[PDB]
Amino acid sequence: NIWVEMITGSDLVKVTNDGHDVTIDQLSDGQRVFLSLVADLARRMVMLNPLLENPLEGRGIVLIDEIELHLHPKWQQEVILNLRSAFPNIQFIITTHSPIVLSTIEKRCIREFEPNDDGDQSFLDSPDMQTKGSENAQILEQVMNVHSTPPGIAESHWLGNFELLLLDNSGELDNHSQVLYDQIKAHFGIDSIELKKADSLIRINKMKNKLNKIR
Amino acid sequence: TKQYERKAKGGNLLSAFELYQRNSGEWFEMCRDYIQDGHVDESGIFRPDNAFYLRRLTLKDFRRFSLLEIKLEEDLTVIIGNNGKGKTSILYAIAKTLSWFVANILKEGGSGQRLSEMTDIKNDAEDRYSDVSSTFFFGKGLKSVPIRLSRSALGTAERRDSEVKPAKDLADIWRVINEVNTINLPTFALYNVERSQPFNRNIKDNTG
Amino acid sequence: RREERFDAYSQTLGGAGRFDHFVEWYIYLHKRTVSDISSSIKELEQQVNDLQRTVDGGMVSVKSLLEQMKFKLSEAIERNDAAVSSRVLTESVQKSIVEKAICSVVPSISNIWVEMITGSDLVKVTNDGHDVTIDQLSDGQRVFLSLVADLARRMVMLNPLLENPLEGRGIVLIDEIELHLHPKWQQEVILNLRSAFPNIQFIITTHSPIVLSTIEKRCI
Amino acid sequence: SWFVANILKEGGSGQRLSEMTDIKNDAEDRYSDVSSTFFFGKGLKSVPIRLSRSALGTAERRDSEVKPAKDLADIWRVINEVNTINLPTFALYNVERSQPFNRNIKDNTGRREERFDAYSQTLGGAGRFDHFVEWYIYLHKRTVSDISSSIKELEQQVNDLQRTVDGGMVSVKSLLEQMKFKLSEAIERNDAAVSSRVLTESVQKSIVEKAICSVVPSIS
Amino acid sequence: SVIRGLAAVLRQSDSDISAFLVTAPRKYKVYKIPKRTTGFRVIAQPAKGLKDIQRAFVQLYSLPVHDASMAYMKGKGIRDNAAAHAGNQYLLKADLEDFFNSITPAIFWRCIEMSSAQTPQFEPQDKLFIEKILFWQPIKRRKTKLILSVGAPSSPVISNFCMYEFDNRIHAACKKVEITYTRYADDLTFSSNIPDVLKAVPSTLEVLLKDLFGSALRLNHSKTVFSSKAHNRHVTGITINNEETLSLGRDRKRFIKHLINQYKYGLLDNEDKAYLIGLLAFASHIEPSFITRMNEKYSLELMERLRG
RNA sequence: UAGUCGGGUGAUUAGCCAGACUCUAACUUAUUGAACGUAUU
């Protein structure tokens, strides 16, 4: 909710934010900036479309740079859908760095720079992968060219190293593989995906070795 | 003229408007209907018969770009890339172009914005000038509205001219028709990273 | 005022830094590196000596000029002495430290230097392999450059006795560390900052899972 | 304002009507016009000027018609450039002229001496009484001094410095060049002053003093 | 020598030709022609005396012209131009900026010097007269700025000649990669049945233009258009339909039918009637089958009555 | 799906019917001059 109060003796715009009545000055920067965008846009459309039943169905071109600016991931999942619902005949031209935003948009709407461009590319094109409804981790790797796990962190490579050690010792936990297993357990925890993967590797490799011995 | 009459009767908006201006009923109503006609779709949303959007953008020796072409969607286009790939440059180029429509809706012969001779020309471009070329669509009766903004680098003795007359011609239709009988007008807005600012209620603008 | 040590505390807790102060200070450092002060003192000493000989030879008209030059010499010596008295790092070394910090922490920037173009001093950068002015940088690059440059400047000014002034102590607060950064930079930013400023206590806010993937849960 | 702007600079712009405040609220035509006609002898019986402004979004623009005023102001400007002529005074004194006096007054930057400082802020409403005081003090200093004595003194100093450089002291060559420049500037200013046919500072001072004492009854 | 040749052709004295030519670059009438949408084009036509000289010059001196040049050529036109591309599925159109007004005496003489095929040789003394014959001075005060005007009878010939080497090179290059190339004045058309070959052509064009003309002649980058059988394809006003046949286009055909229907009920005014007749002659040239269909739809008698 | 091509109907630049096409991808243009078509001769 949004309303004006005058009773204090000065005109104040108030809003109900997360169930609490606050002034605009008390909003977080993320909330305020987004509110500002929508309020400004709505005002202009109302003023310029007096003969429409819904003035927000007017025509126009709106440019937004970094749509995800100050937005929590939760909000990034809603923002394009909400804007397009409210302003159905506006042409939106947007920039983003957010895979979460891209997960809500069709591949046909996306224009992507070539990875090693150097400013001589003649025509922009859409990605090969469908983004709308896809997992964020896939968009990171397939569209944004970024590893889903940080390569500069040693712990990111422990599972790979663990697997290689297991395969070097015919699938049996040797002293070295056990140490690394314990490191994985200690670092990621007993309930971690990483430890479950390690456990899985042990189980599979033990069983493969048993089959090999039977043969 | 008979040529304009034929084109206008074929649904050409510019011809209809030219006939209106020379005779100053029929032609006025054609222009006004072209702008105001539309229908409500199955979802209950009003849809103009004649849509307005940017179709295509071309950048030549502009900032990082030597020669770049972008085809835009009628509804939503999202530009992605690493920092420094020129995403903001593309929006700036479009915003400057749109400034020519806004200026001419406000005032006959109004001036839009310009490319910077200090910053906007590509640093290592052998020809020391830049071009931003846009094409807009406004229904089947005006399929192409081409605009070019141009600028030469600061030292350079040859000067490259902008071509903005088509923008002015279309904006003139909106302005003149509106004056006679009210019409809905297009919204043009840019929201860049400058939209993040502290709020102060205390400051009131007393200009207009 | 930008050369005064305690200018390092000037709007430190205002929220923006003072990147304008950095640029002024950096150009200042460049000009002083091209111009040795002691040769100017030696040259000024020689000029004062030559002017004194002329006054002793009966040319009373140049006495006013001698007094002015003696004043200039005394001021130059005082500046030199104050510089000597401050135990402060040489301007050349200061410049080098800051340049290294910027290039190390900011991925798109490989070099930064001052050019005299026409009649004005201009800071230039090699950004993504191309030479550009600061005004030509992208918002993300500029914002991050601004943060690092400002912080480095203040550390150099406040830690003159350290071999590496960036190993000084302090507390730095950063809101929304991922502001304007692509995912690729978000994967490196915390590592780069902590490597450049090893004894700063960083208290930061983020919305980025990519940033969090580089940090231990104890810090969260 | 349109005369003043064009006397000062080719293509100078005077002031414009406001779209917000100057247009009558209930104007059917949605534009405003301020039309003036000036007289300049029987050779130019009518110099018409119109200042116009239309409301936003009107179908036609209403532009100002300023060319005759510019043409006349150009005659004054161009003829004056070749051979000094007398020029017209334009001034507005509003109720704002009643303001308190800053007792502390600015050092002579040297802008107040320039002839076209007479057009500075001339239509602002308050006058510039601070500029008067600065200019009047300046006039006094010049009257008590001599002009060309500084040139003669500078000429003597350049001659003494030239003798020193001829005597083998090459270190003072830089100072000689600086002083020669100062001498040339002084001569040029003197020549420009001589070229501008401007009254002696003593006479200027006398005229103003007499005017003030004549017009202001309490001041003798 | 040029003077003697002209004098002989025009049955005038050497002296009167020479005298006339002194101010020939200024003997142009300037006027405006309305564009089909809004606005005007500015045209400069030489005075009658000068037109005669220009025609005589063109008659006396044959300059080479490439076969790919379709405009201003005896026995060739827009039909031939369009037909060259009708069998290919992919199309590229490009345009040169300010084509005629970009051609200066400097370019002309360079082209003469560079030309492979047998150019007429001119004496240095004749060069000044030739410049005065062929080039217009738009600015009275600026005697140094001479350009070709579209309105002059010599301008077509000179422009085609100046493009001769360009046409040679690009035609040869295109033929190696199976691209069809034609030029109609400032309008360049490329077509092919091979996918992904036309994309390289614009870059090739820019290089070649720079090589031959430096910065004097440039591509209009706004006017570079790719098309295919997915979309509308036209060449110099002629539609190429999906059956690879030249067409007026559906809308024009429907308009003609409208006019014939109006005529059938005696509703066409004389001006519109004359207009209709003219348009049918053009239709007969581009799409004779359309006329046959109109005869079938409207009675041969009606159509004969109309065309009588 | 959409856009495009267009054979037919239709007091006809509309609407409707039929069939077809799809390199990321047409935006129909300019005279009195030149060339081309037709008429005139």
Ligand SMILES: Nc1ncnc2c1ncn2[C@@H]1O[C@H](COP(=O)(O)OP(=O)(O)O)[C@@H](O)[C@H]1O
């Ligand atoms: N005139 C110029 N010449 C060359 N490169 C330029 C020029 N102006 C800006 N750049 C470069 O363009 C990039 C600017 O990116 P920007 O438009 O802000 O895009 P983004 O928002 O994706 O970072 C930087 O890499 C900068 O070095």
Ligand SMILES: [Mg+2]
């Ligand atoms: Mg004709």
